[PDB]
Amino acid sequence: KIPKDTLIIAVENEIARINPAYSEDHDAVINLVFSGLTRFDENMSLKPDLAKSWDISKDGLVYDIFLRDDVLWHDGVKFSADDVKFSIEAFKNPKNNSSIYVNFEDIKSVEILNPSHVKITLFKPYPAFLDALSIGMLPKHLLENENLNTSSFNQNPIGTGPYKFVKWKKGEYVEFKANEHFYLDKVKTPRLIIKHIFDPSIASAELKNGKIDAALIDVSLLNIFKNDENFGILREKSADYRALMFNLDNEFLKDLKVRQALNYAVDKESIVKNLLHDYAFVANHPLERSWANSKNFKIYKYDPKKAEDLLVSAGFKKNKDGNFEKDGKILEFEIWAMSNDPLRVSLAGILQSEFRKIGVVSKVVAKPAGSFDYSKVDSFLIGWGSPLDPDFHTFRVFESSQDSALNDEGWNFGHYHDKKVDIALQKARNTSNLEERKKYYKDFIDALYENPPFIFLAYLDFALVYNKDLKGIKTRTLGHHGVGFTWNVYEWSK
C-alpha cells in the first residue's frame, strides 16, 4: 500500500522540458517546481504570489510590480528582481522558441528600480498580462549562460515552487519532495509522484489495485467507482471543450458549404445526453465559460436536410450508392482520434455515423496520442480550453500566424486562416476597456460561426477519482485535459 507520507497521482500528459518557457498547458509538473508572480485561488481569483502587489497606469501601458523579499529558489539562492527581468526577457527572446512567446512579445522594457520593484513597459495594452505572469519564474543565476532550449536544467529543474525535483524515470513518472522553505505555506505530504498514465482504463485499474491515489477518470468508467466506498468522486467544472478539427488543406473540407453541412449533420443534443451522460454540455464556440462569451450568437442547429441542401449547392450529387459525389470523387475523408481516449474514440464513431446518414463517407482512424502529427490529418477529434483570460486558448489556436505548418509554437493545427478572426483577436487582446474587449470577442465568435474551423461538440466536466484517505482536495474551474486539478496539491494529505 502507498505510504501515508507519499502521494501518487496519475496525469494524462507529461512534458519533456520541465521549464515554464515551454509550458503548453498540458502538464502538472511545472506548477509543482515553479511559481509565478501571480496565482489563482479556488474561485479563480487573481492573487499575489511571488509578487506582493502591483499598479497599472491609466493607459494600460506600464506595470509597477513589487516582489516578496523572503523567497528562496530550491538551491538556497534568494529570488530577486534579477530573475523576473531575466524570465520575462527569456520568454520574448525569439532565440528561445518559447511556447508562451505570444504572451510576452508585447513587452517593450523591464526596469529593475529597486531589488523588489520592476517597472514593465509595454508597446500596447495587454490586459491578459497579469494572468500571463502566473507562469513560473526562472533562475537567472543558473540559466543566464545556458541555451534555454536544450539545457540539462530542463530535466533537473530548480524553482521557487512547493515541490523540489528528485528524479525522473522517462515516460513513467517524475518524483518530487516537499519544499521545506516554501514561502507560501508548509507542504503537507513530503513525497509526491506524478505518474504518466494517458489511458484512463489503466488509471482506473491502478486506483483499484492501490498503485495510485488519484486520477481523472472518463465518465465511461465511473461505474466501477460509484459503489466503492474506498473512493470518492469529485465533479469538476471546466472550460475544456471537444470538437472536430477540420484540416483546411483537405480538398473537401476547405469548402465553406461542406464545413457548414457537416455541422448541420451532427445531433449534438443526442451526444451529450447519451454518450456523456450529462457530464457535459453542448458546445458551439470556444469561450462559453468566459466573461468574453457574447451569449447571443448564431448556431448550427441539427438539420440533416439543410446539410444535404448545402452539399447539393456545393455541386455534389448522391451517386447510386447514396454517397455525395462531385466530378467523379465521393465526398470522403478521415477522422482521427486519440485511441487512448475512449471519449474521443466514441465521438469519432458517432460523427462517422452522423455523416453516413447524409451520404458523406468517412473512415475512423484511432492511434495513440503523440504517435502521429495532428496537423497532417484530414480531421481530428481535438480539444482546448482555459479558465484564464480568453486570449490564452484562442490566439495560438485560431490566429493565422499560429498556423503550425509555419510556426513551430503555433496551435492552429487545422491551418485555419480568417481575416475577421485575426482582426478580432488582435484588437481584443490589446484593448484595456472590458466592454470593448467583449465587443471584439463577439466579433470573433460571430466570425467563427460564419467560417467555422471546427464542429464544436461539448464542454466537459471532469471526474476526479480519489482514494478516500485523501484529505484537503479543493475544486476549481479546470482547463483543457482537466489541468489544474492538482492546483492545491500542497494542501493534500493522508
Annotated binding residue 31? yes
Is position 482 an interface residue for ligand OXL (rule: CB under 6 A)? no
- Which C-beta is closer to ligand OXL: that of 396 or that of 442? 396
The one-letter amino acid code at 465 reads: V
Among 383, 410, 452, 482, binds ligand OXL (CB under 6 A): 383
Among 130, 382, 388, 447, binds ligand OXL (CB under 6 A): 382
- Which C-beta is closer to ligand OXL: that of 71 or that of 478? 478
Cα(326)–Cα(242) distance, integer angstroms: 30
Minimal CA–CA distance to 381: which of 362, 394, 402, 395? Answer: 362
Residue nearest to ligand OXL (CB): 382
CB of 39 to ligand OXL, least distance (A): 23
Write the CB contacts of 398 (distance below 8 Å, at least 6 apart in sequence). 286, 412, 416, 418, 421, 425, 444, 448, 453
- Which C-beta is closer to ligand OXL: that of 157 or that of 479? 479
Please check whether residue 29 is in contact with residue 489, taking contact to mean a CB–CB distance below 8 angstroms: no
Binding mask 178-207 for ligand OXL (x = CB under 6 A): ------------------------------
- Which C-beta is closer to ligand OXL: that of 409 or that of 446? 409
Cα(83)–Cα(118) distance, integer angstroms: 11
| Number of residues in contact with ligand OXL under rule CB under 6 A | 3
The region that residue 130 occupies, defined by phi over 0 for left and psi between -120 and 50 for alpha, beta otherwise, is alpha
| Run of H or E residues at 338 | strand 332-338
- Which C-beta is closer to ligand OXL: that of 383 or that of 482? 383
Q: How many CB atoms lie under 10 A from the CB of residue 148?
A: 21
How long is the chain?
Answer: 494
- Which C-beta is closer to ligand OXL: that of 438 or that of 481? 481
Binding mask 358-377 for ligand OXL (x = CB under 6 A): ----------------x---
Is position 157 an interface residue for ligand OXL (rule: CB under 6 A)? no
Per residue in 412-448, is it b (16+ CB within 10 Å) or e — as a string?
bbbbbbbeebbebbbbbbbbeeeeebbbbbbbbbbbb
Binding-site positions for Mg(2+) read 31
Which residues sit at the interface with ligand OXL, rule CB under 6 A?
A: 374, 382-383
Binding-site positions read 31
